Amino acid sequence: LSVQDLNDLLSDGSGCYSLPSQPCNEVTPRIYVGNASVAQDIPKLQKLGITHVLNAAEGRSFMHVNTNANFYKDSGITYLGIKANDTQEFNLSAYFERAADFIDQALAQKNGRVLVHCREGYSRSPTLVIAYLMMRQKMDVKSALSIVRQNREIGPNDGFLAQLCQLNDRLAKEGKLKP
Amino acid sequence: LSVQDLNDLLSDGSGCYSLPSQPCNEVTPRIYVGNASVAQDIPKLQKLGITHVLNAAEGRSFMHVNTNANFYKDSGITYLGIKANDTQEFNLSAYFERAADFIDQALAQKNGRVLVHCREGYSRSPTLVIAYLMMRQKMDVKSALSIVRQNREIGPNDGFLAQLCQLNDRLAKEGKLKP
C-alpha cells in the first residue's frame, strides 16, 4: 500500500510526524509553504518578495484562515482562495488543476513568488504544491513528497496522500513523469 | 448591500465561485445536498440511509431533474418535487415553508435523513436548506450560509440570496433568530 509507503517517508520512527519548525519555508525555488500567521503578515510577505498567495484553508472556522482578496488589496499581491477542509473525505483533487494553474500563473514570470498556505502549512497546502510538482514539473509523488518534506515538516492526511497516489498513477500511465 | 456581503463569503477572491468537489455532501447533521446523478442513484441513497428526497429542480429540461414519486416507488424513500428554475426571477421563497416542513417531516424522526438536491446541488437546493436552517434551527442567514458553504461548494443566485435576506429580516424582527 502506497499511502503507507508515503507515510513511512514522513514519520519519525516513533509512530509520529515532526511539526513545522518555522512558520514558512521555500520548499522548491520560488514556492513557499506556510501557516496562517505568515499569510496574515503582509510586511513579511513583501520582504520575501511574494507576488501571489493561494489560501488552501479559506474559511471562517478555527481550522481555516479568514482572509480574502480585500485583505490583500493594494499590497500588490494576487490572491486565490480554496475553502478546503483537512479531512480524508475532502476531495482536494478537484482543485489540483485550479491550484497548479495558479502556481504556474506566478512562476511563469521570472520574478513571481507564490505562498501556498493553510492553517498550519502541514496538510492542505503541501498537498497542492506536491500535485503541482507532479503535474507541471514531472516529478513522481515519492520524489515530489520527498523534496517538500526535506524543506518543511509536512503530514498530508491519508485521504490526500491517496489522492496523490491516484494522480501519480494517471500521470505515470499517460507518460508525463520523469524516470 | 447584503447580497454582496453574502457573495463575498462565497467567492474565491478572483471574482469566481468554486464548484462542488463531490456529487453529495452532508451539510448539517442528517441533511445532504447533492446533484442530479446522486438523486438518480438509488443504491447509493440506500447506503447513505436516505429516507426522504426533496427534488428542488423537478422538471423536463436540461436544467431540471426528471424524477417523480414512481422513480422511488418501493425503494422506501419518500419523495417531494419542486419545479424550480435557477433564475433571479423565480420566487423560491414561496416554497420555503413547504420545503422546511418536508425537511422537518424527515428530521423529526431520529433515523430520518434527507437529500435536498437540484441539478448541480449549487443554487436551488442550498437555498432551501439555508432557509430551513433559518426558519427551524434559528440560524441567521450569514451563519446558515456559512456552515453550508463550509461543507459544500455552493452559489445561490443573487435573486435567491435576496429572498434569503428578506427572510432573515422577517425572522430577526419577529425575534426568531439566535444572537
Explained architecture:
Two copies of one chain form a homodimer. Chain A has 179 residues and is α/β, with parallel strands linked by helices. Chain A has a single domain (1-179), classed as Protein-Tyrosine Phosphatase, Chain A (Alpha-Beta Complex), CATH 3.90.190.10. Chain A has helices at residues 2-10, 36-39, 42-48, 96-107, 124-137, 141-151, 158-173, and strands at 24-28, 31-34, 52-55, 78-81, 114-117. In chain A, strands 1-2-5-3-4 form a five-stranded mixed beta sheet. In chain A, helix 1 (2-10) packs across helix 7 (158-173), helix 4 packs across helix 5 (124-137) and helix 5 packs across helix 6 (141-151). The A-B interface holds A 55, 58-61, 64, 68-70, 79-83, 85, 90-92, 94-95, 98 and B 8-9, 11-14, 18-19, 21-22, 146, 149-150, 153. It is classed as hydrolase. The entry lists the keywords protein dual-specificity phosphatase, Protein phosphatase.
